[PDB]
């Protein structure tokens, strides 16, 4: 991808595939509704 | 990078967390809170006064 992907996964298989694929890089699952989204985004921007 | 600091009689209290090794490990990174900003502490860092 060039632009960051938007995944449409009604079955939920794609999200677990993403978690498994990027587990070695310490991937974190968050949401827009969560109030911790700011700090998660800020940490992702500064530390990968 | 190794660091050598002279004139320790004018010691800056900003070095207190660094000297105390007050690190915060999170997500594979080692964070040191120098002042008000977080810094990834590389394991090769060393300071001599």
Curated annotation (Swiss-Prot), chain A:
Compartmental location: Cytoplasm, Cytoskeleton
Free-text comment about domains: Dynein heavy chains probably consist of an N-terminal stem (which binds cargo and interacts with other dynein components), and the head or motor domain. The motor contains six tandemly-linked AAA domains in the head, which form a ring. A stalk-like structure (formed by two of the coiled coil domains) protrudes between AAA 4 and AAA 5 and terminates in a microtubule-binding site. A seventh domain may also contribute to this ring; it is not clear whether the N-terminus or the C-terminus forms this extra domain.
Subunit (UniProt): Homodimer. The cytoplasmic dynein 1 complex consists of two catalytic heavy chains (HCs) and a number of non-catalytic subunits presented by intermediate chains (ICs), light intermediate chains (LICs) and light chains (LCs); the composition seems to vary in respect to the IC, LIC and LC composition. The heavy chain homodimer serves as a scaffold for the probable homodimeric assembly of the respective non-catalytic subunits. The ICs and LICs bind directly to the HC dimer and dynein LCs assemble on the IC dimer. Interacts with DYNC1LI1; DYNC1LI1 and DYNC1LI2 bind mutually exclusive to DYNC1H1.
Disease affiliated with this protein: Charcot-Marie-Tooth disease, axonal, type 2O: An axonal form of Charcot-Marie-Tooth disease, a disorder of the peripheral nervous system, characterized by progressive weakness and atrophy, initially of the peroneal muscles and later of the distal muscles of the arms. Charcot-Marie-Tooth disease is classified in two main groups on the basis of electrophysiologic properties and histopathology: primary peripheral demyelinating neuropathies (designated CMT1 when they are dominantly inherited) and primary peripheral axonal neuropathies (CMT2).
Family membership: Belongs to the dynein heavy chain family.
Function, as annotated: Cytoplasmic dynein 1 acts as a motor for the intracellular retrograde motility of vesicles and organelles along microtubules. Dynein has ATPase activity; the force-producing power stroke is thought to occur on release of ADP. Plays a role in mitotic spindle assembly and metaphase plate congression.
Name of this protein: Cytoplasmic dynein 1 heavy chain 1
Source organism per UniProt: Homo sapiens (Human)
First-to-last residue of the parent protein present: 3583 to 3630 of 4646
């Amino acid at each position: 991808f060039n632009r960051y992907p938007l995944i449409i996964d009604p079955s939920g298989q794609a999200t677990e595939f993403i978690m498994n694929e990027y587990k070695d890089r310490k991937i974190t699952r968050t949401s827009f509704l969560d109030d911790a989204f700011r700090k998660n985004l800020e940490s992702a921007l500064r530390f990968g | 990078n190794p660091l050598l600091v002279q004139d320790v009689e004018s010691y800056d209290p900003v070095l207190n967390p660094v000297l105390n090794r007050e690190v915060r490990r999170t997500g594979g990174r080692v964070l040191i809170t120098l002042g008000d900003q977080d810094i990834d502490l590389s394991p090769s860092f060393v300071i001599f006064l």
